[PDB]
Design a protein around this ligand. Sequence first.
Ligand SMILES: *C/C=C(C)/C=C/C=C(C)/C=C/C1=C(C)CCCC1(C)C
Ligand SMILES: *C/C=C(C)/C=C/C=C(C)/C=C/C1=C(C)CCCC1(C)C
Ligand SMILES: *C/C=C(C)/C=C/C=C(C)/C=C/C1=C(C)CCCC1(C)C
Ligand SMILES: *C/C=C(C)/C=C/C=C(C)/C=C/C1=C(C)CCCC1(C)C
Ligand SMILES: *C/C=C(C)/C=C/C=C(C)/C=C/C1=C(C)CCCC1(C)C
Ligand SMILES: CCCCCCCCCCCCCCCCCCCC
Ligand SMILES: CCCCCCCCCCCCCCCCCCCC
Ligand SMILES: CCCCCCCCCCCCCCCCCCCC
Ligand code: NA
Ligand code: NA
Ligand code: NA
Ligand code: NA
Ligand code: NA
Ligand code: NA
Ligand code: NA
Ligand code: NA
Ligand code: NA
Ligand code: NA
Lengths: 269, 269, 269, 269, 269
Amino acid sequence: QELGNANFENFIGATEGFSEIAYQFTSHILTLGYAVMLAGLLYFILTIKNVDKKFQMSNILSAVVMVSAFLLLYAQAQNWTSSFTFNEEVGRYFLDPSGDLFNNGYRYLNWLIDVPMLLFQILFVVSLTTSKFSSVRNQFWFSGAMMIITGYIGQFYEVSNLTAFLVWGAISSAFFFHILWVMKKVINEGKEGISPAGQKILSNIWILFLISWTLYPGAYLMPYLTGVDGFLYSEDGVMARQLVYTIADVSSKVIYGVLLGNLAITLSK
Amino acid sequence: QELGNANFENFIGATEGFSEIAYQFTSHILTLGYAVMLAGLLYFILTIKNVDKKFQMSNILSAVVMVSAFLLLYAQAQNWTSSFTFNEEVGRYFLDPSGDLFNNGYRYLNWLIDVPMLLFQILFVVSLTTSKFSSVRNQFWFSGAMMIITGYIGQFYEVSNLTAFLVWGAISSAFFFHILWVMKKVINEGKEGISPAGQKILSNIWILFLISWTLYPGAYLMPYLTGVDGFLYSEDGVMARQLVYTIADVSSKVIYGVLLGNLAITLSK
Amino acid sequence: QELGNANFENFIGATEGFSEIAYQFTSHILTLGYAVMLAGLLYFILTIKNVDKKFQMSNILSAVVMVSAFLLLYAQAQNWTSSFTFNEEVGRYFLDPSGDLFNNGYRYLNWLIDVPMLLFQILFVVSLTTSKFSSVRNQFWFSGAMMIITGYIGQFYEVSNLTAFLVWGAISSAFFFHILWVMKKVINEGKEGISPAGQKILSNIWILFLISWTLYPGAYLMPYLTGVDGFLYSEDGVMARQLVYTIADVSSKVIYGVLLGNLAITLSK
Amino acid sequence: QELGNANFENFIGATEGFSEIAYQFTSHILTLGYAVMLAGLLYFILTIKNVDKKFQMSNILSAVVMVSAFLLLYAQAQNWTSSFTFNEEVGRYFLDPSGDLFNNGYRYLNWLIDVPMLLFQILFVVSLTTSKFSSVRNQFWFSGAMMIITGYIGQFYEVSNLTAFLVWGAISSAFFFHILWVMKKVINEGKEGISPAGQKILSNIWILFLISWTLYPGAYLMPYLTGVDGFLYSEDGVMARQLVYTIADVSSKVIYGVLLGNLAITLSK
Amino acid sequence: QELGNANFENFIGATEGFSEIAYQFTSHILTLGYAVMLAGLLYFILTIKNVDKKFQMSNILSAVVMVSAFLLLYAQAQNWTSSFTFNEEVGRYFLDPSGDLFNNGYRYLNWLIDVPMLLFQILFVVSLTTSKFSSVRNQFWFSGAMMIITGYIGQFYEVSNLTAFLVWGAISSAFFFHILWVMKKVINEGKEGISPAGQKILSNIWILFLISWTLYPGAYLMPYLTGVDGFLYSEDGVMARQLVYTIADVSSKVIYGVLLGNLAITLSK
Ligand SMILES: *C/C=C(C)/C=C/C=C(C)/C=C/C1=C(C)CCCC1(C)C
Ligand SMILES: *C/C=C(C)/C=C/C=C(C)/C=C/C1=C(C)CCCC1(C)C
Ligand SMILES: *C/C=C(C)/C=C/C=C(C)/C=C/C1=C(C)CCCC1(C)C
Ligand SMILES: *C/C=C(C)/C=C/C=C(C)/C=C/C1=C(C)CCCC1(C)C
Ligand SMILES: *C/C=C(C)/C=C/C=C(C)/C=C/C1=C(C)CCCC1(C)C
Ligand SMILES: CCCCCCCCCCCCCCCCCCCC
Ligand SMILES: CCCCCCCCCCCCCCCCCCCC
Ligand SMILES: CCCCCCCCCCCCCCCCCCCC
Ligand code: NA
Ligand code: NA
Ligand code: NA
Ligand code: NA
Ligand code: NA
Ligand code: NA
Ligand code: NA
Ligand code: NA
Ligand code: NA
Ligand code: NA
């Protein structure tokens, strides 16, 4: 069967197929995904009047990220259940082409608009010292865009052309390190001037950001983390990838937003 | 027909099939389920300004539980009507594999995020005495997560492997008793310092929590409560399970939230 | 073909079929149904600040009834259009089993949660004299629940077993008369102490309640009001039943809520 | 093929079929329809605090009309795209009976709840002189209901029985002239006492009301405005009818509501 | 295969078909489209109280544009995924007529209502000097309507009749230049009287307006920008057109609205 430049999920579903657990779990973890985002949207809106007017822009941007996140992640959950149908004879879910091939593209475009907002909102809670607001913002937005775009191109060849997949992934990584660098500066300059309590939170925010954001490139390689024809190049790798994405999404957006809200309250008078 | 690690609902629907009453009732009870959650969401939002600012976090967390509860339970209602199609010849609903196998997973992931919030919101209304806030919270969140996760794994083998089903159920029960223990402490310490009216409510909250939360493990075993090839291992057991879940969900979330709101008002000045 | 314990709508659609008018009208009247409930929801929310804080609980409960009413009635409207497909040869809509059998169950569960709220909200506008608040509430909630449950069971046998259908209907009627009795007391005690204007409204509320609530049992018997093989035991009876339900729903919930709001304004200072 | 008492759209789609333009345009104009209503809903809600409390009831009723309008007009849109499928051989859209026959009913019952509200809201902005509020209201509500009901019956025979179609249309027209009469009185009495600016607006409101409301009966006859086997008794007549309805709906509800809001501001202090 | 007066997307999908990348990308860019509009809607509503009451009409009109923009663009996204189904044998997406032919009409009607509001909202932030408010408004609204309508007619013949396609496109362009002319005047008169900061923003708004609005006519010709049987008259041209539309939509509505909000704040006291 000819699939072309398709995600590895389609190859597993078209050959081996998915077990009740593998299929159901992937459905539940994606469903929990968009559910958390709508729950977060309601939280950030109902807690806007809990911080000084100057910090409220942080809750608004968190809400903006939640909305778009809910829609894209919701569409993704529907794309999964639509691309795989149960086979009575063997008792496994196989690729149903009539429902379109499954693609992690809806999530990559969710990042495109999110990344910029997530990096931008912290600049409304913390105060830079030697770095210019506009300068930091422009760096985040540029590197952020190039990181997502390059990665979006590579994920299409994660099976059809392993070379292109890694080359683009590498280029993407370049911009990722630059973002980590700028964010590190923002955290340091942010700690200067605030109470020890605020510093404690910024320290936790940096750890959360570092770990949660690293999970994404991990999910990108998931199918090859145990080498070609490895343990992860199966339905196990599919479950792992979608699970990691969900954990990363909740941590990088919802939890990240809650911590910023807590810091905003700490600095509020 | 090969189903594998699927819920017992699929086995009844694939062999005996469901009667108009059995199928329709299950559809109505699941529909009423998500309907109540959206009605509750509107109630908790419209009554936020009825309690002092310090207690408002309780209404917000109730609203958060309602939202996710509406989405997951809605999907669960669709997972039912889609998995069973009517057969004109015999006049019963049989497993329609094209609509995917029915799984009580969506409800298990709803708990995962709910359990933590439900246990945490009471800590914004009552005041601990001989227990540390962070300590109690960490215990609830840990045991709560382990309880749901372990149970989620077991429910997949409720037919394929009765042994694994019970072992996991038992492990889950362990964490459940620990939660009941901590909650009992919270209630007692909560009663100390408040008016007799507030104590009266906390007493009712403890009874509600004890009964409603016990229903879940009951629904877990529902198909075997009358032993293998028993009265409950039929469409009657399916109706019973989904009914008990719905009663438990409404009691543990909506009614539990209303009582907390009433207590918040009682302590409001 | 054996339909079993199914509503009479399915028997008409499976034998005679439905004409363009019969089918279209039923679709339009059910569509208008959920449309009115969402319109009402918006009205009760936008008019909350039009009455004293003590009466606002009435608008909130009206809103709660609207929400659930919209969801259940929206589903009921889908249960119709899905259960009947057009036959080109004869030019009539016949039972399409793939879309499930049509059941007035979604509406019965909508009452289960509504009835309690509708009877309870009037206790926030009027002031009892010799009757205890808790006492009246408990009677409404108990008789209300037993009335709906018993009726829900009977409607399943409206064709399969005419005897069971009437027996349950009769038992249900018992609790209905008890509710009418308690409501009559509440109205009388409510009139005592308020202005002639307020009394005028309570008089209208009693008439509305009496007529609108009586329509339900009428819709229950609709198919046999002209005896077996009568004029109403046709597509005409189907249209009549769904029409009566819609009229009853709009009157008992929306109009009832508007009058309570007008009374609240009359008593507001 | 037997269609029976069906709208003429079905006859054109079942015989000649629809061209890409005819089908696409009808879809676009109906889509724009419900889109405008949801846009209007947001406008009337966000501008409520722009007028004195006494006039705010006008914005609320406009919002009520928008909601219902959005739901019914959305359904009407779906009814279209579902009833006609593309034929590859000939390259035209033909009647797809599996999607139900297309009916302009959803739009008629929409007028049933709208008409009364649209005629009633103007009574909260203008002040009657010699006419009684209750009197005018009762006339609008009665004639309004009889006008819609009679018309709703006739539209079912616009093809099957041209005689019944015209008779009902005529009866409907009777109540329409009575409404125009009462509205004319309301406008005149409304002009007395208000500023020249307010009078200027009421003059515009009367012209808008006169033209927009006249379009409906025009859309009713659309298929026979060029006589039987005429230019309009084709896909051209279908486009014309749905276009006229959309123009009428936007003018009679959205624009009408905006003008009433502007008048409210003019009289606001 | 006979398509008639259909968009070129259908001809590519009916002959060559679409690759996984071409199809998936178009789906992602359209999905991101409606997602951004709902995110913008939430932003404009949550920031209304950030500007003086006199400028708030700008946020309201932005919100109005977002709503209708979300619904239409959502409908446009669905029109895509439904019109093209995957072929297992060749591994490409081909025209699925059962899902209707794809038409960029839903986007042309979104402009019809947007264009007027987008041109009108700037008149609530800036102050004209020698130009009359009513005069400018009437010109925008007239030329705006004629521009969209004429273009909407031409796009139907972008393949069937290249002559009609260009003629209408040309006529449309005429009204486009007139709009650019009037907008230029508004910007100039707007700069007079405001601070250098406000002027800086209006300068950016003019550049954004000029570029973003020019993209639309570019997307209109996209398939012929490399001449007939050119590089762009392929799936590459389809991706390019939908991408350009998405960039134009986000820039002309969301970004344009954000800049107006920033200017409103700059002039706010
Ligand atoms: C809420 C969305 C977030 C935080 C998205 C983050 C995305 C990344 C950090 C992506 C990084 C990637 C690489 C560094 C290489 C491989 C491709 C990417 C895009 C997954
Ligand atoms: C609103 C959701 C709630 C209250 C969820 C509660 C879940 C439980 C109490 C689950 C308990 C279980 C056991 C003790 C053993 C069997 C497996 C479980 C998870 C059902
Ligand atoms: C908004 C929902 C309302 C007011 C529901 C009311 C329901 C009843 C009054 C039901 C009564 C019935 C009987 C008295 C006998 C037959 C069965 C019932 C449940 C229809
Ligand atoms: C927003 C809805 C409105 C303004 C509806 C108005 C409806 C009419 C004016 C209907 C009039 C009719 C006739 C005068 C004769 C033919 C049948 C009708 C109902 C279309
Ligand atoms: C948010 C919607 C906007 C800004 C829409 C703008 C539309 C145009 C500028 C359209 C212009 C066109 C021409 C100048 C010629 C070809 C046809 C059009 C309509 C695409
Ligand atoms: C303060 C709260 C106390 C409320 C008391 C009564 C209200 C609860 C109503 C629920 C009762 C329903 C029980 C159903 C009985 C089983 C029916 C079987 C068919 C005969
Ligand atoms: C002010 C509250 C009282 C309102 C009474 C005024 C009239 C409004 C209700 C009109 C009801 C119309 C129902 C039509 C009757 C049946 C139609 C027969 C079809 C020819
Ligand atoms: C005071 C403002 C007056 C204008 C507002 C009303 C807007 C409606 C404009 C009427 C034009 C509709 C005609 C549509 C033509 C369709 C072809 C009809 C064939 C008989
Ligand atoms: Na997003
Ligand atoms: Na599936
Ligand atoms: Na939940
Ligand atoms: Na089904
Ligand atoms: Na309800
Ligand atoms: Na149907
Ligand atoms: Na309406
Ligand atoms: Na179609
Ligand atoms: Na729009
Ligand atoms: Na597709």
